[PDB]
């Protein structure tokens, strides 16, 4: 499912402390915060990378 893949991408992009020491993708939008471990993140139609 494309959903799982989208989540994989978001995961690769996240830039809140405690995620990726070096994010290979740039979180151009609400790619989640440290407040919930990236779970806050917005829907794919929202964020860019």
Partner 1 sequence: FLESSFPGLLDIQGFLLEFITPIIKVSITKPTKNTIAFYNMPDYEKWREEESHKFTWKQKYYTSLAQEVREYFSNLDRHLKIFHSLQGNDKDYI
Query: Residue 30 binds which one of DNA, its own copies, partner 1, none, with CB within 5 to 8 A depending on kind?
Result: partner 1
Burial status of residue 41 (CB atoms within 10 A of its CB: 0-12, 13-18, 19 or more): buried
CB 38 within 8 A of CB 16: yes
How many Å separate Cα 42 from the centre of its chain?
8
Residue 35 interacting with DNA (CB under 7 A): no
Q: Is 21 in the site for DNA (CB under 7 A)?
A: no
Quote the least distance from Cβ 19 to DNA, whole Å.
8
Q: Is 9 in the site for its own copies (CB under 8 A)?
A: no
Active site residue 46: yes
């Amino acid at each position: 499912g494309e959903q799982s893949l989208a989540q994989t991408i978001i995961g690769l992009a996240q830039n809140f402390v405690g995620s990726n020491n070096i994010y290979l993708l740039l979180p151009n939008g609400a790619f989640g915060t440290r407040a919930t471990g990236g779970k806050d993140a917005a829907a794919a139609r929202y964020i860019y990378t």
